[PDB]
Design a protein around this motif. Structure first.
Motif, PDB file in Angstrom:
ATOM      1  N   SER A  37      46.930 -11.375 -76.157  1.00  0.00           N
ATOM      2  CA  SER A  37      47.160 -12.681 -75.506  1.00  0.00           C
ATOM      3  C   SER A  37      46.794 -12.631 -74.025  1.00  0.00           C
ATOM      4  O   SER A  37      46.215 -13.609 -73.528  1.00  0.00           O
ATOM      5  N   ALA A  51      41.892 -12.690 -74.583  1.00  0.00           N
ATOM      6  CA  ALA A  51      41.613 -14.145 -74.599  1.00  0.00           C
ATOM      7  C   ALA A  51      40.914 -14.617 -73.320  1.00  0.00           C
ATOM      8  O   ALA A  51      39.901 -15.351 -73.438  1.00  0.00           O
ATOM      9  N   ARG A  68      37.011 -15.994 -73.454  1.00  0.00           N
ATOM     10  CA  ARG A  68      36.602 -17.375 -73.107  1.00  0.00           C
ATOM     11  C   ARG A  68      35.610 -17.356 -71.942  1.00  0.00           C
ATOM     12  O   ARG A  68      34.666 -18.159 -71.956  1.00  0.00           O
ATOM     13  N   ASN A  74      58.306 -18.179 -67.743  1.00  0.00           N
ATOM     14  CA  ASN A  74      57.188 -17.651 -68.554  1.00  0.00           C
ATOM     15  C   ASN A  74      56.515 -16.510 -67.815  1.00  0.00           C
ATOM     16  O   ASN A  74      55.715 -16.777 -66.870  1.00  0.00           O
ATOM     17  N   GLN A  86      57.866 -15.581 -74.138  1.00  0.00           N
ATOM     18  CA  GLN A  86      56.729 -16.510 -73.998  1.00  0.00           C
ATOM     19  C   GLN A  86      57.013 -17.789 -74.777  1.00  0.00           C
ATOM     20  O   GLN A  86      57.354 -17.711 -75.973  1.00  0.00           O
ATOM     21  N   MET A  87      56.884 -18.923 -74.100  1.00  0.00           N
ATOM     22  CA  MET A  87      57.052 -20.233 -74.768  1.00  0.00           C
ATOM     23  C   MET A  87      55.701 -20.956 -74.746  1.00  0.00           C
ATOM     24  O   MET A  87      54.986 -20.918 -73.703  1.00  0.00           O
ATOM     25  N   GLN A  88      55.368 -21.607 -75.855  1.00  0.00           N
ATOM     26  CA  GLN A  88      54.036 -22.239 -75.950  1.00  0.00           C
ATOM     27  C   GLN A  88      54.118 -23.735 -75.662  1.00  0.00           C
ATOM     28  O   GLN A  88      53.384 -24.205 -74.778  1.00  0.00           O
ATOM     29  N   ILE A 133      50.423 -20.614 -69.014  1.00  0.00           N
ATOM     30  CA  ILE A 133      50.863 -20.585 -70.430  1.00  0.00           C
ATOM     31  C   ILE A 133      49.883 -19.696 -71.184  1.00  0.00           C
ATOM     32  O   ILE A 133      48.644 -19.902 -71.067  1.00  0.00           O
ATOM     33  N   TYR A 134      50.427 -18.723 -71.911  1.00  0.00           N
ATOM     34  CA  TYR A 134      49.570 -17.791 -72.690  1.00  0.00           C
ATOM     35  C   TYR A 134      49.793 -18.043 -74.165  1.00  0.00           C
ATOM     36  O   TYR A 134      50.953 -18.128 -74.620  1.00  0.00           O
ATOM     37  N   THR A 135      48.690 -18.177 -74.898  1.00  0.00           N
ATOM     38  CA  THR A 135      48.765 -18.469 -76.347  1.00  0.00           C
ATOM     39  C   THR A 135      47.981 -17.437 -77.111  1.00  0.00           C
ATOM     40  O   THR A 135      47.545 -16.417 -76.508  1.00  0.00           O
ATOM     41  N   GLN A 136      47.775 -17.675 -78.401  1.00  0.00           N
ATOM     42  CA  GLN A 136      47.137 -16.623 -79.226  1.00  0.00           C
ATOM     43  C   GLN A 136      45.680 -16.443 -78.813  1.00  0.00           C
ATOM     44  O   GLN A 136      45.239 -15.290 -78.667  1.00  0.00           O
ATOM     45  N   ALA A 137      44.966 -17.544 -78.611  1.00  0.00           N
ATOM     46  CA  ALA A 137      43.510 -17.430 -78.360  1.00  0.00           C
ATOM     47  C   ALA A 137      43.121 -18.205 -77.119  1.00  0.00           C
ATOM     48  O   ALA A 137      42.221 -17.767 -76.399  1.00  0.00           O
ATOM     49  N   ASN A 138      43.779 -19.322 -76.881  1.00  0.00           N
ATOM     50  CA  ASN A 138      43.435 -20.137 -75.697  1.00  0.00           C
ATOM     51  C   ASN A 138      44.374 -19.817 -74.529  1.00  0.00           C
ATOM     52  O   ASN A 138      45.291 -18.969 -74.663  1.00  0.00           O
ATOM     53  N   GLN A 139      44.134 -20.484 -73.400  1.00  0.00           N
ATOM     54  CA  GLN A 139      44.996 -20.278 -72.213  1.00  0.00           C
ATOM     55  C   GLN A 139      45.224 -21.642 -71.563  1.00  0.00           C
ATOM     56  O   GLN A 139      44.276 -22.216 -71.023  1.00  0.00           O
TER      57      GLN A 139
END
Lengths: 49, 50, 99, 495, 50, 247, 50
Positions: free
Chosen positions: C20, C24, C28, F121, F143-145, G10-16
């Motif tokens: 993560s 990533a 990108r 976060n 971590q919160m999405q 914010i950190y996600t699985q594939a995007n940011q």
């Protein structure tokens, strides 16, 4: 594109001059192979000129 | 025969991709060997045999 | 072949947080660069190596310029606890070692 | 000859590049998901005690751990070495077979040997005979549908030893910090993260500066005093009230399952699947079997496939071959017409080329040799030599015909009689040149051993056909030339 | 070396010409060793393929 | 805008601009969101073909997310793309809305909520365990999405009553910058522009993106319709075929 | 307060994704939205910008 369009005439002119010499040696009625050979020999210098 | 032989190798060296690159060296190496052999045959052997 | 390996080692980080926070962003950043034909990543515990294979028409120097530019431009978004900045390698898998 | 040329070209097995025995073997060691450093190290020590017992092996090189090459903590890559040619007694196949049946007896271990090569095109080192990738959209969906493609795709006879690099049975520990409970003692998620990282994170914090070198300072915690996961709750965290608050009062601990490695393809989760094809089936049967399996499993619509290696190489070769042959044949026609200043004479020379192909393909089928692209090049050289001696006879035939004006049949008779000795000196030279490649038993021989047999078969078949067919077929082509002259006269007469 | 030696021996035995025997043993090594001279301008590297 | 002398090769100029932008980095402001990036684009270079994406019944933020996750990258995946400029970028993000009167009433500053959000976060290394039998990795729900977990965070305290972000402020999914947007004829849309690659054929590349045009439309959600508004391969075709006909 | 400042990540699985801070202007139109902002103090209270 426009270069080729204009150069069409330049390219056709070489065929024009060779057909010119060959027609010159055809109209009067000389021997075919001899007329072609002699014409090529006499005007080969002009075209390269 | 010298001129006609290269006609086999004339197209091969122009193929692309990894196979084309890796056979380019073989093709021109063979060509250079043939040309140098031809020159040596027409130059040295006539004198040695004359 | 045009193939660039970049390595980012960051100790302790679990594989998921490594994916993560490390793969990533640069993925990108690298994806928008021209010449990229396919990409693959080997992301594991504390490790992140990136495999980029380019088209046959790309010179190596220009590809090095793009990878340097991308790694510089994506620097801010990288985690701030990286021990070393990520370094690129001009090594193709076809090249064997000497001794 | 032409019909059998087409039939054999279709019938002969093909090959991309050949295998070579340089003396090193690279193998991968697999360990259970719950593996650690002590267990993996002790297992490596046991295997090293077992593999070195073999007489053919002389040394081992093995490095494990998190690096830019190794894939996981439990996954170990080995680089095996062998004695040079003049001291060991068996080749790569039997030595690697003995090495594989030697380690299978060892309990608790499994090791995948693949003999390494010299010229590598693929960006990855293969484990089994073939490998391919499956592309999906999300980690969770493909993870949950991993068991389906093991429990339903394994039973096809054409598809055996189904395996993938992804394993989703890894043990992970989860701590759940309560957001509401944290605000009571004035502690944030940042403090929890900092405490956990500086407790069990192998964190690098301080720097040491020396005269010439640069050392680092690392923080670590002891686990020897308290074994088990009970070492985690002994860590303390600061508080606004000033005391120490245990992690038991602000968080709970749970155990779940997470994957040891995440591999990605085209910005989407992917699996690399490797397996072995039965020798009784071809790659076409395998890929069609994969087709009906992926159709029958009712997979989510977001599951696609992608393949690499032999299929792409063979498709590229097929795309290049037809254009290469057409351009080549056009080139020979042009140069031979330049050399002879005639229309059908080059066709007479071009008609003798395919004869050598029949001999080459028959020999390679008989010799049981892989048809690598080097074999195709050898067939090309065979055809070149054939055209060389063909030109050798035709040049003198045409010179005699133009000089003596004698009838063509006695002309070719005299030309063959005066050029026969050249035919056998050339044939002997070709035979002695191909002799070393036939008996090549040394280092690199895998890259020259089939070429000798292929060239020798091509040469003897080509001369056998040439010496008994060329003169009469050339006379028949001269008769066809006479009929074409009749056609020229007609097309100048009634047209 | 054994290819050249066998070629020289077979030429001597077949055409019984000692002059025809001196030519190959010097010409073939001369051509092969002297072949790379033109290869210099090509700047290719001798390898297994070469 | 820097225009050099005619004798400077492009690669060396790129080297100098990279060196200068690296050397001047320290003096730059420290709140820059992205480092400055150079472009090897001359104004004489025209684009190849422009694509614009619009929707009818689904919010523009998810439209932009969807298009730059699948549509933009796959189109840019093949050769023939110099630089895709997603003009009017309505990039998705998380927004927090502050009520001045309510927060001013409780006597708390924006620094407090700033500190709380910063401390909420943080996704950093958590390390792993080693033992004699098994090894594990540590991972926490730090971590919160989405926006509900940001909303539920407690950001202030006042006489025992838990003061959260939701009860005193509003948070809703939106765009990262409200001042970027694109309009297509009469409706609103997102527009991206495709540059060119030197030494690349344009007609074949345009035919390729035309061939993958329907593959994306079926892949796009039914509420999204993509369209093309400008190109130059048509004038190239007109020129070449007119010249052919004339000759 | 009124800078459209980008602060959190914010950190996600594939995007940011990013987190942005903004203030409301609808409730109070005009430049009278500026003086409603508060500033911290050493004494602990809120002091108006006026």
């Amino acid at each position: 594109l426009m270069a080729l369009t204009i150069a069409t005439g330049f390219v056709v002119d070489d065929a024009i001059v060779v057909i010119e010499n060959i027609s010159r040696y055809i109209e009067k009625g000389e021997k075919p192979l001899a007329a072609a050979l002699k014409g090529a020999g006499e005007i080969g210098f002009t075209i390269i000129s | 025969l010298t001129f006609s032989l290269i006609a086999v190798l004339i197209p091969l060296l122009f193929m692309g991709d990894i196979v084309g690159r890796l056979f380019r060296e073989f093709a021109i190496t063979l060509a250079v060997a043939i040309l140098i052999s031809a020159v040596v045959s027409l130059t040295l052997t006539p004198m040695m045999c004359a | 072949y045009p193939t660039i390996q970049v390595v980012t080692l960051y100790p302790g980080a679990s594989p998921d947080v490594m994916t993560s926070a490390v793969t990533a962003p640069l993925e990108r950043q690298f994806g928008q660069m021209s010449g990229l034909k396919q990409m693959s990543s080997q992301s594991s515990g504390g490790a992140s190596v990136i495999t980029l294979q380019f088209q046959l028409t790309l010179p190596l120097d220009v590809a090095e310029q793009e990878v340097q530019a991308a790694i510089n431009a994506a620097t801010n978004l990288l985690p701030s606890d990286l021990p070393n900045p990520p370094v690129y390698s001009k090594v193709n898998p076809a090249d064997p070692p000497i001794m | 000859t032409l019909l059998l040329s087409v039939l054999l070209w279709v019938f002969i097995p093909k090959g991309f590049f050949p295998v070579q025995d340089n003396g090193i073997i690279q193998g991968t060691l697999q360990a259970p998901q719950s593996s650690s450093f002590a267990n993996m190290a002790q297992r490596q020590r046991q295997v090293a005690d077992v593999i070195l017992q073999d007489p053919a092996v002389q040394s081992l090189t093995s490095f494990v751990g998190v690096d830019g090459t190794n894939p996981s903590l439990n996954s170990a890559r080995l680089q095996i070495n062998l004695k040079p040619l003049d001291e060991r007694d068996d080749r790569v196949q039997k030595v690697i077979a003995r090495l594989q049946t030697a380690v299978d007896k060892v309990p608790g271990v499994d090791l995948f040997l693949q003999p390494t090569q010299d010229l590598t095109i693929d960006t990855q080192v293969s484990r089994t005979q073939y490998q391919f990738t499956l592309q999906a959209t999300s980690l969770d969906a493909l993870s949950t549908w991993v068991p389906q493609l093991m429990e339903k795709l394994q039973q096809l006879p054409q598809l055996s030893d189904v395996s993938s690099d992804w394993q989703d049975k890894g043990l992970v520990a989860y701590v759940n910090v309560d957001r509401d409970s944290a605000s009571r003692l004035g502690i944030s998620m940042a403090d929890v993260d900092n405490a956990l990282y500086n407790a069990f994170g192998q964190r690098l914090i301080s720097t040491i500066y020396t005269q010439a070198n640069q050392y680092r300072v690392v923080l670590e915690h002891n686990t020897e005093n308290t074994p088990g996961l009970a070492a985690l709750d002994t860590i303390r965290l600061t508080s606004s009230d000033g005391g120490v608050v245990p992690l038991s009062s602000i968080a709970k601990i749970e155990q779940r399952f997470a994957p040891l490695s995440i591999n990605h393809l085209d910005q989407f989760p992917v699996t690399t699947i490797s397996f072995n094809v039965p020798d009784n089936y071809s790659l076409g049967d395998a890929v069609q079997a994969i087709m009906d399996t992926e159709k029958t499993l009712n997979l989510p619509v977001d599951i696609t496939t992608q393949f690499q290696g032999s299929t792409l190489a063979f498709q590229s070769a097929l795309g290049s071959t037809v254009w290469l042959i057409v351009a080549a044949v056009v080139a020979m026609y042009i140069v031979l017409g330049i050399l002879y200043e005639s229309f059908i004479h080059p066709i007479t020379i071009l008609s003798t080329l395919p004869t050598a192909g029949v001999g080459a393909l028959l020999a390679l089928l008989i010799a049981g040799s892989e048809l690598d692209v080097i074999a195709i090049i050898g067939i090309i050289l065979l055809i070149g030599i054939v055209k060389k001696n063909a030109i050798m006879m035709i040049d003198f035939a045409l010179a005699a015909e133009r000089e003596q004006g004698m009838s063509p049949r006695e002309a070719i008779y005299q030309a063959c009689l005066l050029r026969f000795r050249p035919i056998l000196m050339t044939t002997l030279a070709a035979l002695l040149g191909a002799l070393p490649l036939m008996l090549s038993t040394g280092v690199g021989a895998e890259l020259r051993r089939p070429l000798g047999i292929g060239m020798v078969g091509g040469l003897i078949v080509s001369q056998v056909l040439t010496l008994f067919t060329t003169p009469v077929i050339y006379l028949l082509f001269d008769r066809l030339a006479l009929w074409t002259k009749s056609r020229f006269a007609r097309h100048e007469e009634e047209a | 070396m054994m290819a050249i030696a066998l070629v020289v021996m077979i030429i001597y035995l077949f055409l019984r010409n000692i002059p025809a025997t001196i030519i190959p043993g010097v010409a073939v090594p001369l051509s092969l060793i002297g072949t790379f001279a033109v290869m210099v301008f090509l700047d290719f590297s001798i390898n297994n393929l070469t | 805008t820097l225009q050099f002398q005619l004798t400077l090769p492009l690669d060396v100029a790129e080297q100098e601009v990279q060196a200068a932008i690296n050397a001047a980095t320290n003096l730059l402001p420290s709140d820059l969101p992205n480092p400055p990036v150079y472009s090897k684009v001359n104004p004489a270079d025209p684009p190849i073909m422009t694509l614009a994406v619009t929707s009818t019944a689904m919010p523009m933020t998810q439209v932009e997310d969807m298009v730059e996750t699948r549509v933009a990258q796959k189109i840019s995946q093949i050769s023939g793309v110099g630089l895709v400029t997603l003009s009017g970028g309505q990039r998705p993000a998380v927004r927090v809305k502050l009520n001045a009167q309510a927060i001013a009433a409780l006597g708390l500053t924006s620094e407090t909520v700033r500190t709380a959000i910063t401390g909420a976060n943080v996704n950093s290394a958590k390390g792993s365990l080693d033992g004699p039998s098994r090894a594990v990795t540590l991972s926490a729900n730090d971590q919160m999405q989405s926006a509900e977990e940001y909303r539920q965070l407690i950001i202030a305290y006042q006489n025992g009553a838990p003061i959260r972000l939701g009860d005193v402020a509003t948070v809703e999914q939106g765009a990262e910058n409200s001042w970027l947007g694109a309009w297509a004829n009469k409706e609103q849309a997102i527009v991206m522009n495709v540059q060119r690659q030197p030494g690349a054929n344009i007609i074949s590349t345009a035919d390729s993106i035309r061939q993958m045009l329907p593959q994306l439309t079926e892949s796009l959600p039914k509420s999204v319709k993509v369209t093309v508004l400008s190109d130059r391969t048509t004038n190239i075709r007109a020129s070449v075929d007119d010249t052919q006909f004339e000759l």
